[PDB]
Amino acid sequence: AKYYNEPCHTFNEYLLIPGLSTVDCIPSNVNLSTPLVKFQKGQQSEINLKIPLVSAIMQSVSGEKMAIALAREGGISFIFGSQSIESQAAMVHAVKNFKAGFVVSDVCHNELVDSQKRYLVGAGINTRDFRERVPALVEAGADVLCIDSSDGFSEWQKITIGWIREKYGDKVKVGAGNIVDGEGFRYLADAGADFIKIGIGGGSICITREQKGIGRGQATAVIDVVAERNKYFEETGIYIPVCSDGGIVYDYHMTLALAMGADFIMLGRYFARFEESPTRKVTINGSVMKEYWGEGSSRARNWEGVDSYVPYAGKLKDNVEASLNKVKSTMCNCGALTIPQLQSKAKITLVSSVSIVEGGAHDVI
Amino acid sequence: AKYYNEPCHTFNEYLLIPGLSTVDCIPSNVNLSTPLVKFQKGQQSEINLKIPLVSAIMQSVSGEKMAIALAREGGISFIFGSQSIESQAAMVHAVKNFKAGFVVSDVCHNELVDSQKRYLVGAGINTRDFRERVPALVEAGADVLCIDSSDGFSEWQKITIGWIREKYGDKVKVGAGNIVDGEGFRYLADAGADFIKIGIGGGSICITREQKGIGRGQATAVIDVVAERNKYFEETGIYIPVCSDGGIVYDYHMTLALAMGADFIMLGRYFARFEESPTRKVTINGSVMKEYWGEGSSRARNWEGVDSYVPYAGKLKDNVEASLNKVKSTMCNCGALTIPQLQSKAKITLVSSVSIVEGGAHDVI
Amino acid sequence: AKYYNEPCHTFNEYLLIPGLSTVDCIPSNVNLSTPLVKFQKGQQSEINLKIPLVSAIMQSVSGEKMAIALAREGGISFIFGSQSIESQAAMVHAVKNFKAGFVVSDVCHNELVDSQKRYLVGAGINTRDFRERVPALVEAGADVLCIDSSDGFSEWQKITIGWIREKYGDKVKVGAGNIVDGEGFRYLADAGADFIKIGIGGGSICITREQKGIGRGQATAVIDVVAERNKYFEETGIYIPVCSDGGIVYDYHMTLALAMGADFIMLGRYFARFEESPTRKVTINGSVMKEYWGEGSSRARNWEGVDSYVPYAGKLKDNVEASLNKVKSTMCNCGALTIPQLQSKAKITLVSSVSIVEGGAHDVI
Amino acid sequence: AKYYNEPCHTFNEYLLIPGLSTVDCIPSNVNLSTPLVKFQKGQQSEINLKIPLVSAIMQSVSGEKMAIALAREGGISFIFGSQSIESQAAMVHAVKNFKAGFVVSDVCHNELVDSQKRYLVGAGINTRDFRERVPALVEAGADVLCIDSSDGFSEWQKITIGWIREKYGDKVKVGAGNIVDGEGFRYLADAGADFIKIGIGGGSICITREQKGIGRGQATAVIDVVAERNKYFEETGIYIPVCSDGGIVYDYHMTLALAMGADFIMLGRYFARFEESPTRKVTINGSVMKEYWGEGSSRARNWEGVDSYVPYAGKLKDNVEASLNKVKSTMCNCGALTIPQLQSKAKITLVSSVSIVEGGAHDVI
Ligand SMILES: COc1c(C)c2c(c(O)c1C/C=C(\C)CCC(=O)O)C(=O)OC2
Ligand SMILES: COc1c(C)c2c(c(O)c1C/C=C(\C)CCC(=O)O)C(=O)OC2
Ligand SMILES: COc1c(C)c2c(c(O)c1C/C=C(\C)CCC(=O)O)C(=O)OC2
Ligand SMILES: COc1c(C)c2c(c(O)c1C/C=C(\C)CCC(=O)O)C(=O)OC2
Ligand SMILES: NC(=O)c1ncn([C@@H]2O[C@H](COP(=O)(O)O)[C@@H](O)[C@H]2O)n1
Ligand SMILES: NC(=O)c1ncn([C@@H]2O[C@H](COP(=O)(O)O)[C@@H](O)[C@H]2O)n1
Ligand SMILES: NC(=O)c1ncn([C@@H]2O[C@H](COP(=O)(O)O)[C@@H](O)[C@H]2O)n1
Ligand SMILES: NC(=O)c1ncn([C@@H]2O[C@H](COP(=O)(O)O)[C@@H](O)[C@H]2O)n1
Ligand SMILES: [K+]
Ligand SMILES: [K+]
Ligand SMILES: [K+]
Ligand SMILES: [K+]
Ligand code: NA
């Protein structure tokens, strides 16, 4: 077998060490734009998010209301593919035609839209019924697709991406994953993926141990994939955006993920807490909660995972603004006005096993 | 004294990183056959389990019902030697002649059997009364034997194996152990053991600390012994199968043990939970349990250990099938269709002390 | 991004290994004097504390009573700058003119005073209203100033120090910070700071995680900054005193901080517990407590942090004497009669993650 | 300051890996004799314990009854020096003349005795009143002395040993300590100590943190001192026995300490639990306990430490026999018939931070 020189680490094990903060670096001047799909050296990505956040490909997270609310703030949602093809396509259609009208024939500056001023939206696909699902999603106006899988290091993803390239060329964008090391990244890169998703085991509703025992600390996975991605860019001139998917517990984990090289972040739990998630708001002994279940739970694929509750946080807007203000502020502490500058200048340290306690409040009531 | 460069590690500290999964790798096509006894280069083992699981040499685990139920699924049981010679021989006889008849003279495709279609069965032996016990076990039809001891790195095991080789040549198969490093493996190998058992301290009912303070993390022990075993094979052309005995807490620990090089796994607690274990099913406040005690407990050698209870799991069959389906699935994630292929391709990483939390469910109710 | 070879560590992870204790080293002969502001090689600092302790620049810690009580024992207080300029200046004035009289016009041997026998006092300043605040503090008789910030690695601190040097030359002393590595130290050194404050995240009332995720273990930060400070001294002949700010939980952490190279220590919680802190003494179910809130709490900047309680410890005097007696005693165990000698001779070891338990009381009721 | 390449470790972090156990190694044939005082190459120590255990120099442990009971089993006690000179001398006298008679003038094979068949006994001394105390202890018949201190790396110990050598030459044996590294060992060795005591912080009733912050993991201290001791022996031909003092929680820690090179072990808590300790047997809610307080507690030096209770274990004899049987058994697992052979052959591994759980009982009720 093959072993590694170092054990893997998660986001909670790192802290950012400040760099020189210049007078021009104030939160309001920080630009959080980031590339969504691959491009060649010297070019810009055809699709750029205005904020580096995308909602997870999950029944309990990315419905049409979520896709609209997130696109309004500059991010994009990946409508879950764990439903009928007709049903998923309808959600995509509804998001693409939201600015049309509520009836029949009887102003956000950071909104993410296409040349027709329509909100951008993504859609998850699987390696099974893609020959039928993909065309339906394209016709519905889906702006980007993403193969949804726990282990993307599969010949099935290569076949799926190939079928798409052969039928649509580079006109249909498709993300692939998840992978956790350079090998996996490289395989999906050569296969043609437009962006590669990183992460296995990190998800809040994912229990590696009580399952198959596959996975890797999210930080180590990101750092490793990013290095491979950069090597790949140098060899081929092709820059493939990568997504850190899962494991985000605190807002600062977002800054860490971006600093380590992730272009954007995929979150489930974070977004499930919002009013706009498709789940039910349930009140439990004075506490308003929201349902949250993984795609691996029996409750999902009935059309490996856990079914739970997350505290209600209110509307997506105020929460995302609060989170990103903290990211922007930290970026300035690091001397960065943009994500690429942060990825270049960030000073990232690992913290001791016997520590972390000093970081929080201690010896006080 | 002699010290080591690295501290030892247990199974819970590792995770498997996926490899390329090909289209032909589906769980149902995974072959879990594995060698039980040593053979020369270019040959096949005279005895091959159909599944890499064997039940522990314990009074509370391997009785005749267990031996039958496990052999039916492709594994083998080692009838405990902590009983009279006449008593142990009778159990072996009963298993060997089960397909004869229930009265007097008045279709499982993965069953493990001999050329006479009789279920295979093993039997534990000790370094004391082997001159009387061995012959009785052979006459009873025991297919394989195994010296049962916590520290097999002993001249007593060499003497026992020698007496067997001198009286039966290579016609009687005998496993030896337990050992935890290359030195111990090598000693029992040169002594003639047909398979070597790995593990000291890992057992669920074993408390190293509150005892002698001998032992080693099961993962490190396996990895070390396997390297020595491979070196030995290269020098002599003799391949000695090794058994990871104890420390298996979760199903994925099985995949880990095999990936690290263990040919098969010995379990006690896992099998004690089944209907077929010889212990009593006792109901405690709505919870049906089964008794489980170690061979080192006073409750056993009365014919060092602990006496406890394990939750009833039902019949052996459905449980073993569920466990192995998960192993097979993980093997495909690793790009392996067989155990040898898994041992060759597995990518095994250690996980941080400050982690493991990310792996399971977190920040959710 | 930039990574490090070792994870950071906190004070709780270290222990001092004794050196040769000579007959002349008794606690009463230990000199705890230490430099407060920078000087050139061959000179002495214009200001020397008699004890290496200074109270934090916080509303709940350094009021006029605290400044007087601490100066009497040989330390200095930094009157909080999170109040009106007129208000802060009045506190400084009151401390400077305390030995004048209680009415109107109708003997501590370790006291820290100026050439006029008046108690020394410091005052915190910010990078915003310094053009108005500084002059007012100088006129009031402030002996030393200190820019109060969580991330001193800022162009704003350079501008502030510059404005001070241009208007007052080297006649007005100003400390800067906080920083946690050589880079940050070097930047503030070249900027002209008279002393540099070390520490981000360590504070008892500071929660890095639930915030921005910036920081570093206090021990590692001190050790790193001190090495840079020593390198800087060798290159320029300028010795810049450094302050370990925050993270002190136990008295021995004080000895550790000094041994690692910190010239003096800044504490908040430690001093808040005293009668002389400006907060209210509140009795909670038989326990007399004192309020303690960080400057980052909403309760403070209303003229990021937490509001809490700390157990009442009584008057500053008896507590500081008890603490320093322990430091002095430990210094002799290390063969040191002075702080510089301790920094030179201390033998400092890191302790294992799996330990620390042996250090305290164990296996006893 | 001076730092180290590795963090220190305690006994709980190690396990012994078995070696070849020969047929002649049975517990009853294991010899636990060990040297108490220094000797030259080619010679034997003038005093050899029959078992490697000595009771701590504590008021709550080593009284006359303890000294008698322990000497009967082959060990020696160090009558506490924290009492009047007349009082301590009387205890020594009583032990030396126990085989005389209970009234006035009106058969253990492992007993430790002198040429007059009298039980051996030791006595602790301090660096203060030794000019009066020593003569009184010698006249009383004390067989060996030991300077009692938490930091033996002191010029005071050199002066004390010197005064003894000048007045008695090498006729009076005196141990010194405690130290935790090669430097300290070397200093007391050159000073003339007959044996050197290792350990600071390990004691069950010692709380390093809540004190001065001096100390080192007991295992690391022993390993380091032993290496220095062996180097010293090679350079001078003088073999100085060393004592691992404190930190023994389990019986296997005894085997570990000896395997790492300690010639003998000093214990406090272990012996306090016995009927023969001078403290009071107190019954607390059905549990018979014994008082146990450190020499650093105010309760002691009233003629830094804690006052507590330890569960009653009964008579010293049965307990020491049980403990040593386990040590002897483990020694055979390691292929050792004597302590020197164990120190030479022991294979000692460190165990992972994330482990230790596997070692004990797990996943069972
Ligand atoms: C597919 O959605 C995921 C993803 C993206 C991830 C994980 C996961 O468990 C599931 C659910 C797993 C399912 C439905 C089993 C099918 C499969 O193999 O894909 C994970 O651990 O990392 C990433
Ligand atoms: C023999 O069965 C075992 C085995 C196989 C192992 C251990 C163990 O404790 C016992 C019971 C120990 C007994 C009955 C003491 C006799 C002996 O020395 O064999 C263990 O720790 O690793 C493996
Ligand atoms: C300024 O006072 C501090 C200091 C000195 C430190 C920290 C901190 O949180 C605050 C409060 C932080 C505030 C009021 C936000 C403004 C700022 O950015 O300065 C810390 O973590 O290390 C040192
Ligand atoms: C002297 O007895 C000890 C010993 C042997 C040790 C320690 C200790 O705390 C005390 C009590 C400490 C006292 C009475 C203070 C006087 C002194 O300095 O000796 C310890 O930590 O390691 C070893
Ligand atoms: N284990 C499951 O059932 C399941 N369902 C989804 N997931 C993974 O977890 C991610 C969400 O993680 P989280 O809640 O944001 O930590 C998803 O985008 C996906 O990669 N895991
Ligand atoms: N300590 C004991 O009393 C005892 N009895 C059996 N054992 C060991 O534990 C193994 C079972 O481990 P487990 O329950 O499967 O974790 C046995 O095969 C044996 O090697 N240990
Ligand atoms: N987080 C906050 O609100 C806050 N307020 C003050 N501080 C920092 O904490 C220090 C006090 O730490 P402590 O209480 O002594 O551990 C201050 O000197 C400052 O550097 N942090
Ligand atoms: N801290 C104290 O008050 C105190 N008193 C004794 N000791 C140390 O602890 C040892 C006993 O340790 P333990 O109880 O056996 O773990 C003593 O021999 C001595 O070195 N420490
Ligand atoms: K900065
Ligand atoms: K795969
Ligand atoms: K000393
Ligand atoms: K052995
Ligand atoms: Na903190």
Ligand code: NA
């Ligand atoms: Na998880």
Ligand code: NA
């Ligand atoms: Na202790």
Ligand code: NA
């Ligand atoms: Na165990």
